[model samples]
Target: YVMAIDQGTTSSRAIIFDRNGKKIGSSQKEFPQYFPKSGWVEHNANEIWNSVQSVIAGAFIESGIRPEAIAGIGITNQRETTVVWDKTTGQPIANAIVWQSRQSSPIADQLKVDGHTEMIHEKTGLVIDAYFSATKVRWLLDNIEGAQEKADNGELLFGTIDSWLVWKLTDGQVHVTDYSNASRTMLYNIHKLEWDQEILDLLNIPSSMLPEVKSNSEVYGHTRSYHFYGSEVPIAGMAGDQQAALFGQMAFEKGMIKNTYGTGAFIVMNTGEEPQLSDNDLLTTIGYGINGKVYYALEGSIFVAGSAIQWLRDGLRMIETSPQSEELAAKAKGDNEVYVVPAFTGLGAPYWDSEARGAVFGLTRGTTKEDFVRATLQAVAYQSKDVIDTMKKDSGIDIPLLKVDGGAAKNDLLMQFQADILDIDVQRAANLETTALGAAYLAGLAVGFWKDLDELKSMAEEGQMFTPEMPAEERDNLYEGWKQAVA
Candidate 1:
């Protein structure tokens, strides 16, 4: 058995899969989210760590599988969620700055104002934004009174959530990060495959705090017996969430794309071995490094996807649960006229406007809550098309299909509308846990739990496909209305 620890924005999950890539046991637990101020999202790193440990044990108890039965372990996590901690005590210095947080926007804005936009993007394949770790690292070091001093003294450590979890799992015996997570930091030179000292100097980040970079599918370290109940399984694989989904989707060829709709919607297209910097706003990221070859990807990031649905449930009180949005939307009487621009954390990709707030249009007295709910559902699809359209222009590749997975992909209503809005087929993974499965596959490969790519491919499952059913005229008309509202 292979285990996968999926540390996400709202929750942490542990899934155990067999040699056939079928889930044998699984456990999931959601943790608290901190919102100290408007547009700021944070997580307690300790709470996240505790949640991970709980689920790891919970999976074994639920599945009746022992930890010693696991061949190896893999980890996939929310990318760009930055945390700074003390090396001596293994405690976090401050709340982890979530990828969705904009507290460090001013720091990012200063980079653009200071004329490092081209240099930063060229080196990191990332737009200058607080969404990456570089500015957040600077924010923590700059705002905390003695952090810089301690960091300079080699007492503080910095890492994405992956590295933090790894450190805890190994009892701080190892400090390392994989290529996929490092590529999101804006501190690593993706082209040079090393930390860019110049950017570190510009941000005044001490290189000493950084973790050693490794490939995605190697044994970074072993889970200490205390953490794994007398088992010291090799913790072999690591990847950022979206890139792991790209792998789980088996999009091995160049030009193949997969869209993962989580807290945000991320669209990643494999661009093959060498990185292809986007002429447009799409980010160039490492897909995964495996079998001595590194693969690169082009990504279109949307800040709000299912979170829009969450707003409808928690913020708007339109529904009691997430799945109820579908039931409510099915009763909508409108002609699909309303549009919701969910730029709650500001717009992402192509636009890259960190200051833009959300707005609604085409509302009338005749509109009902059902229309509101339906439009919110359509909002997810609309924003996706915005990214997909731009990605098409940047990559110069025709996207006939969008392979999708995540909680929201289970909505047939949204899936059909996504097919309508993008005017392309939308395929949903049969086992929606591709995020976790990809990590399982990676770790499984390293310890000979599985032999190679061909063997893993044989165990793959076919997903249901939603093909375009909207007429070109109506599709063009609705998308035009969305563009107007976005403008």
Candidate 2:
């Protein structure tokens, strides 16, 4: 038995999986989000830590299993979400600034003006933007009281969600992150596999506060007996969430691509054996380094996908739950003819327009809630199509199908519409929650849960396939409309 913790931007989840990678049970809990001002997002670190413990218990209860039966724990978390904590007491000095937050835009703009963009792009395969953690971490140190002094004196530690969880779970004994998560921090050198001291100096962040980088599948440390239920389970696996999704989808081969539709939409194409630079604005990231060989990926992030449905449920009261959006959307006519640009928190990838906000169009006085919901769902597909097209162009690989996962992938309406818009097949596995499953596979491989990658690959089952049926002209016309709406 293995337990996987999928710590996300909007919530925390725990899933229990058997040795065969079959789901035994799961539990989830959402924490509060704080937006002190526009473009600034934060989360209470203590709240997130508490939520993790609660969901672990909740998942065990739901599965009717004992913690002693678990062999190990794997962690896959939202990357670039910055967290700094008091090393002495395991308390947060300030709220965790999320990846989507734009509070550091001014600093990023200044760096860009200083002509540092090209250098950063060349080294990190990432843009000098507020979307990353470097500038956010700098902001926290500069603005948060006594942060600089604490940082200089080595009294505080900086980490993404996964590192923080490990620190808390092990009672501050372990302070390390996996290579996948380190690559996203904008301060780590993918080629060198270590924190780039030059980038840290440029961002005005101390190199000492960062955690030691480790391989994704190795045993970083064991949880303290006080944290675990009397047994010290090895914290065996870790990855940034999208990378985890890539591993979860089993996209281990060269040119294999997968798209995950969650609060945001991400399309990652695995570049086997070597890291490939992107000519487009997309980021090049380490998918995961296993068995002494590193696999790279070209990633394009769309800032909002499932959140548009959240708007329908929470903002408009159009539906009681997000799943209901699918049913309502399926009722739309063949030509409701609406478009929603889900830029609720600004645009990501290719565009990288942090200044732009969300917009919707094609609404008529006669439009019902169903039509609006349908447009929102279709917009996710259209946005994904835009990124996939760019990926194909940049990588020069004609990907015929995309492996899809995440919570929103469970909506058949969304999945079918996505495939129709892309004019390709969308493959959904029996397990939609691949983030946790991928983490489990990583740890299980190391600890002899399975013999080899083939054993893990043999478990893949094609649960559903959404094939494109729309006429080419209609698909093009609808996508063009979506582009116009966002513009």
lDDT (CA) per prediction: 0.67, 0.68
TM-score of each: 0.90, 0.90
Runs of candidate 2 with Cα error greater than 4 angstroms are 62-68, 88-90, 122-124, 223-231, 288-293, 334-338, 361-371, 467-470, 482-487
- lDDT per residue as tens, model 1, 1-487: 7676676675776576664656765466666555576677777677767787776656674455555567556677778877767777655566677777667776667657655667766555666676677777777767665655666766667787777777776453566777777777766756766776755776574476667778646754464665554445566667777767777677766666777776777777766776877766667766643343568767776666666666666556756677875675565543465676666667665776777756666766646654556666776776777877776675668886667777666777677766665556767766767777776666665555666665544554455786555456555776667556555
TM-score of 2: 0.90
Q: Which ten contiguous residues of candidate 2 have the minimum total lDDT? A: 285-294
| RMSD after CA superposition, every candidate | 2.8, 2.9
lDDT of 2 by residue, 1-487 (tens): 7777687675777577665666666566667655566656677677767877775555675455654467556676677877877766555677788777666766667656666667767665777667677777767767775656556666667787777777776453567777877777777766667877865875454477767778646754465665554545555667777767776677666667777887778787766666777777667776643342457766775666766776666557756666775565565554455666666556665777767765656767646654566666777777777777666675678876667877776777777766665566867766768777776566666656656555555666775776556466566765566456454
The TM-score between candidate 1 and the true structure equals 0.90
Model 2 steric clash total: 0
Supply the global lDDT for candidate 1.
Answer: 0.67
Best by lDDT: 2
